[model samples]
Target: GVYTVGEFMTKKEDLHVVKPTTTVDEALELLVENRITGFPVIDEDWKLVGLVSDYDLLALDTWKTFNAVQKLGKLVGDLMTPAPLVVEEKTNLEDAAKILLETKYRRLPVVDSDGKLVGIITRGNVVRAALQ
Candidate 1:
């Protein structure tokens, strides 16, 4: 049997996450600093509630001619995609890899039964799991 997502996923503690209250500029800073494309939005309990990606900002830029005021004034909650698709800790590595590639998502949020954020699985994580 192949390995599981939990074995190769990046733990939440090491994650560069964002809060719903986080400013767009702050979230963008993390994205650039971490050199990553997206971030999981968590709550006080660290539950995975939504997602924010550079694509969200890119989407904003498309309508920048007049929306800059509205867009720049918004928080992560204003732009985040709620209830993002996620995977469980027990999911198989190959299965997760398939989802990542098929969906073209940079990473998938991993959660527990109660929907608490646990970790993240990415294309790189899957490949590393396979190389072992």
Candidate 2:
């Protein structure tokens, strides 16, 4: 199913984010504060370079893992998916849909020509578009 990024993007700007250099604690704080499932980690220039979701937290060494606080001590840069999947705001709807259908990522970050984060597109948006 083809779907435009704008069709499902959230106008709200309260998105979770972390600077590339941000410590794990900082990222965790942002996620907790926003009650977000995860966050797209950006760099100083606000480039969509990585993504960090709670699911990735499972990568922590189970044998070494203790508590949530312990996990918060790690750096987000270490856990985030580097060179994340990104698409343009004007990307073809079919391409966007294909990416989502072929991947496990829940959302796709929408960027401008300059590659700055503008909005986010989730599966919910694609589903809603079909009903329209």
Candidate 1, 53-80: lDDT as tens digits: 8878455444565445544567888788
Off by over 4 Å in 1: 61-72
lDDT of 2 by residue, 38-125 (tens): 8787788887888887656445435445445465455778888887777776677667777777888668888888888877877776
TM-score of each: 0.84, 0.78
CA lDDT, candidate 2, residue 49: 80
Worst 10 residues of 1 by lDDT: 61-70
In Å, residue 74's CA in model 1 sits off its true spot by 0.6
Which RMSD does model 2 reach against the true structure? Answer: 3.0
**TM-score result, candidate 1:** 0.84
Highest TM-score model number: 1
Pairs with steric clashes in candidate 1: none
Poorest 10 consecutive residues by lDDT, candidate 2: 60-69
